[PDB]
Ligand binder design. Structure first.
Ligand SMILES: Nc1ncnc2c1ncn2[C@@H]1O[C@H](CSCC[C@H](N)C(=O)O)[C@@H](O)[C@H]1O
Length: 208
């Protein structure tokens, strides 16, 4: 029910291009090592942890987390993205569980089961983002980590301001721990996480 069918339809339409490093999803492929590194550092490693990737799409982050030895469940409402994610995981020889349902349904059935919940580039596509934040808080174990991010900007989607997201987080059992932005660094000629969240961000929260 907390789903925008038009938004889902857009991702279903481009699903076949998901793993093209030079296609539409290039920025996510480029961004992935950086977000993975941040998640692994902030959560204290992923080996052996139960992890839920909310709005996983084609599985760019999910598969990368499973590669580091996590037990990963990827959740999405799109049919074709999950078909692509499953096939790509098989091709890679990586075990990932992909499910088609809403985060609210998953939360009601799997409360407090996850060590880590990641919710990347997803909130701006939902009709009621606060409900998603509440759900992720319910899905995580006590002391577990929940990450939210918008590192990819477009012309399209809406931008949810970090200050607004913090308000939603504050109504739940999650506590903000760290926030960072993504920036071009001319000296190294690379993109790096660092201060400044005016335009993009990644937020680390921990369940209390
Ligand atoms: N209401 C909803 N419930 C579950 N998934 C949703 C959703 N609305 C959008 N999505 C999914 O969110 C994805 C956004 S693209 C983000 C993919 C992945 N999180 C990554 O960063 O690599 C799309 O695959 C879309 O189908």
């Amino acid at each position: 029910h907390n789903v925008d069918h038009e938004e889902i339809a857009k991702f279903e339409a481009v699903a076949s291009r998901w793993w093209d490093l030079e296609g539409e999803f290039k920025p996510l492929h480029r961004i992935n090592p950086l977000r993975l590194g941040y998640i692994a550092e902030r959560a204290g490693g992923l080996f052996g942890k139960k992890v839920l990737d909310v709005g996983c799409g084609g599985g760019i982050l999910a598969e990368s987390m499973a590669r580091e030895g996590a037990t990963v469940t990827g959740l999405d409402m799109g049919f074709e993205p999950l078909q692509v994610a499953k096939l790509h995981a098989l091709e890679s020889g990586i075990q990932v569980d992909y499910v088609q349902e809403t985060v609210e349904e998953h939360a009601a059935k799997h409360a407090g089961q996850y060590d880590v919940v990641t919710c990347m580039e997803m909130l701006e596509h939902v009709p009621d983002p606060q409900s998603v934040v509440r759900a992720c808080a319910q899905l995580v174990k006590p002391g577990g980590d929940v990450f939210f991010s918008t590192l990819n900007r477009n012309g399209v989607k809406k931008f949810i301001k970090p200050a607004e997201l913090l308000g939603w987080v504050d109504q739940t059992s999650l506590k903000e721990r760290h926030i960072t932005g993504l920036h071009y660094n001319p000296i190294t000629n690379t993109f790096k996480l660092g201060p400044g969240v005016d335009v993009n961000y990644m937020l680390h929260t921990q369940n209390k």
